[PDB]
Amino acid sequence: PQDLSEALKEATKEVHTQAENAEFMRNFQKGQVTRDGFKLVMASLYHIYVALEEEIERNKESPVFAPVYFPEELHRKAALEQDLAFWYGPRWQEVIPYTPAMQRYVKRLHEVGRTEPELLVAHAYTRYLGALSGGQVLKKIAQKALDLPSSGEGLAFFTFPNIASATKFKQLYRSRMNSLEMTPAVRQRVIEEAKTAFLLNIQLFEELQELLTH
Numbered sequence: 001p002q003d004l005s006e007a008l009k010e011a012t013k014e015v016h017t018q019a020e021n022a023e024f025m026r027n028f029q030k031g032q033v034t035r036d037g038f039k040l041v042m043a044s045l046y047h048i049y050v051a052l053e054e055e056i057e058r059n060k061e062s063p064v065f066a067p068v069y070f071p072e073e074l075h076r077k078a079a080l081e082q083d084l085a086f087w088y089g090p091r092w093q094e095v096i097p098y099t100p101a102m103q104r105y106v107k108r109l110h111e112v113g114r115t116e117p118e119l120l121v122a123h124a125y126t127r128y129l130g131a132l133s134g135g136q137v138l139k140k141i142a143q144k145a146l147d148l149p150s151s152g153e154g155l156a157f158f159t160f161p162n163i164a165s166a167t168k169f170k171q172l173y174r175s176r177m178n179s180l181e182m183t184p185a186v187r188q189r190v191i192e193e194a195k196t197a198f199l200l201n202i203q204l205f206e207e208l209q210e211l212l213t214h
């Protein structure tokens with residue numbers, strides 16, 4: 001398509017479906033999620049966003065990313081830190097798992113941020129725009145499945161407090177993405193990186209499912 005935001009959505013429909021079809025996510029959507037399983041997903045989200053925001057902060061002034069730099073509206077690290085303290089306790093930093101599949105995702109994020117920063121937008125799009133769209137549906141399913149007490153914590157990740165209107169912000173974020181200047185060769189790679197992001201999530205889901213079935 002013409003607009004990058006339009007091209008991204010179009011090219012990732014197939015892999016997005018695969019994500020939804022992943023056994024781990026199938027169970028999740030069927031409301032068949034356990035606390036042990038939800039803890040693992042929160043853990044991986046932490047590693048993922050720490051690496052991602054670390055790289056974004058590194059290329060924020062670069063012309064290949066600056067346009068989609070919205071730190072206050074999107075940053076998720078503090079949110080996950082709060083959440084993990086609830087899920088794994090005060091010593092969460094010493095006990096949260098950091099699995100091989102999580103590491104493979106983290107390693108690709110640092111690789112892009114450091115050797116192909118022009119592709120970072122692919123990951124910011126996939127994480128942030130994704131979380132902002134299908135984030136509510138998964139949170140709804142989660143709480144309704146988890147049966148959390150009433151301690152007022154554990155799900156801050158699913159709320160973007162600095163964004164008043166999700167639809168208005170996504171319009172803006174798409175605009176900014178469509179303003180990025182890139183050669184057709186780069187655009188094709190940004191498109192490919194996005195699909196790869198999905199694949200990294202799928203192999204993560206496959207790993208988490210394996211760890212939980214024993």
Ligand code: HEM
Pocket residue numbers: 005008009010016019020021025029125126127129130131133134135137197198201
């Ligand atoms: C398997 C559970 C998932 C469900 C049920 C889910 C659901 C949704 C829904 C309902 C939307 C709403 C906006 C729309 O469709 O127009 C959406 C958009 C999106 N999702 Fe997912 N999603 C899931 C997993 C993921 C994963 C693993 C990623 C990637 C890390 C992701 C990335 C995206 C992106 C980037 C968009 C926005 C695309 C665009 O606007 O161009 N989703 N998702």
